[PDB]
Amino acid sequence: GNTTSSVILTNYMDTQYYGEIGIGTPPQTFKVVFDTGSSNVWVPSSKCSRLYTACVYHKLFDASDSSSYKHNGTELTLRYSTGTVSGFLSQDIITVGGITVTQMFGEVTEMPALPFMLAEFDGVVGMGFIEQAIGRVTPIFDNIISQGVLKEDVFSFYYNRDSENSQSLGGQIVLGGSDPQHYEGNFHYINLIKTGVWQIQMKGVSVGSSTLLCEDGCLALVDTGASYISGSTSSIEKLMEALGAKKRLFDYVVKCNEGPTLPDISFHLGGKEYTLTSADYVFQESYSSKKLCTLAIHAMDIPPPTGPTWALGATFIRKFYTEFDRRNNRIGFALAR
Numbered sequence: 001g002n003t004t005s006s007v008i009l010t011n012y013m014d015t016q017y018y019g020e021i022g023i024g025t026p027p028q029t030f031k032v033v034f035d036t037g038s039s040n041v042w043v044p045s046s047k048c049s050r051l052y053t054a055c056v057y058h059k060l061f062d063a064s065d066s067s068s069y070k071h072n073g074t075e076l077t078l079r080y081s082t083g084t085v086s087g088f089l090s091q092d093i094i095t096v097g098g099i100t101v102t103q104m105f106g107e108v109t110e111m112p113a114l115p116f117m118l119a120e121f122d123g124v125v126g127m128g129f130i131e132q133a134i135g136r137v138t139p140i141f142d143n144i145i146s147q148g149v150l151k152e153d154v155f156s157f158y159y160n161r162d163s164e165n166s167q168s169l170g171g172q173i174v175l176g177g178s179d180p181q182h183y184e185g186n187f188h189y190i191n192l193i194k195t196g197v198w199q200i201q202m203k204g205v206s207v208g209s210s211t212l213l214c215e216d217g218c219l220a221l222v223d224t225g226a227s228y229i230s231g232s233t234s235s236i237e238k239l240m241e242a243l244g245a246k247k248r249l250f251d252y253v254v255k256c257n258e259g260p261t262l263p264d265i266s267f268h269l270g271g272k273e274y275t276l277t278s279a280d281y282v283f284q285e286s287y288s289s290k291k292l293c294t295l296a297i298h299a300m301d302i303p304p305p306t307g308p309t310w311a312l313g314a315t316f317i318r319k320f321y322t323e324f325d326r327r328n329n330r331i332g333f334a335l336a337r
């Protein structure tokens, strides 16, 4: 068609980027992450037991208040690297950036405190392919494309560096195109290894001058739902050894004074080198030799068939404006602004 639709995103602490969607008639509004690492839409349900503290602290969908709701009831379990949710399938009208679509989604009735008591968002909108959809439910972007309204069969992500500042724009998703106000130079495209997953070949990971990791190639999942850049436990422990970082419970840390002294990290993608300086990957909350500063990179062991794989999350997207091209099964990067 002839239209472009944008979704304004809120940036919470450079870790969570989410926007609003409306579900039902009248619309029930939810804060959702737009996740290229998954293919299902879900929100917490009014049928969720209140013994789940996450269901007490999040917005719940009430099918009994929606006149456009259509029952299904098929049970589903959605397993992620950080945790699992369980519930059942429902159908209703979903509003995303002015676009209205009839969508099958999950009503979550089992929502663990860890990690969901840490989510500022309520649910998730899966931006991945039908191949990875649980219960083979048609993903939302596929349903939007069927309407024949969007200018291009593409969607783009802008994640802002600034979270603290008001009047800044936390981020932005453009359905059906890109926003040239948020990137500079030209897009550099990398073809997907295969359709069904937003995953590309990575030809090397350099720490400083030498290529210390991913010699002989490896995989890179471009994941909008991930806060950090992640690699396997084996890759990260080698990376962190090179940086001189100390392993804590879930993350890696450096003495704050040493943060600025850290080397550049380069990701070799489609013949181009994508470089992050220490300012890009260190949470520089102070300069004290008496304080510990977290790194926006951690270990995450993603199981087969998708993994073992690196994941390029918000840490990477903040520097590089990303276009997800469904028409040509490729990913484009440009310097964000």
Ligand SMILES: O=C(c1c(Cc2ccccc2)n(-c2ccccc2)c2ccccc12)N1CCNCC1
Binding pocket: 015, 016, 033, 035, 037, 038, 080, 081, 082, 083, 115, 116, 118, 119, 120, 124, 223, 224, 225, 226, 227, 228
């Ligand atoms: O499990 C996670 C991730 C989730 C929770 C989630 C689940 C589904 C969609 C979006 C966010 N979060 C997460 C973010 C904030 C609070 C609690 C969890 C991560 C933070 C860093 C790395 C990974 C994940 N992912 C796997 C699936 N793709 C996105 C990343």
Ligand SMILES: *[C@@H]1O[C@H](CO)[C@@H](O)[C@H](O)[C@H]1NC(C)=O
Binding pocket: 071, 072, 073, 074, 089, 136, 137
């Ligand atoms: C739920 O919807 C799916 C469509 O994917 C269909 O296969 C199934 O029969 C539906 N179940 C009910 C109980 O309506």
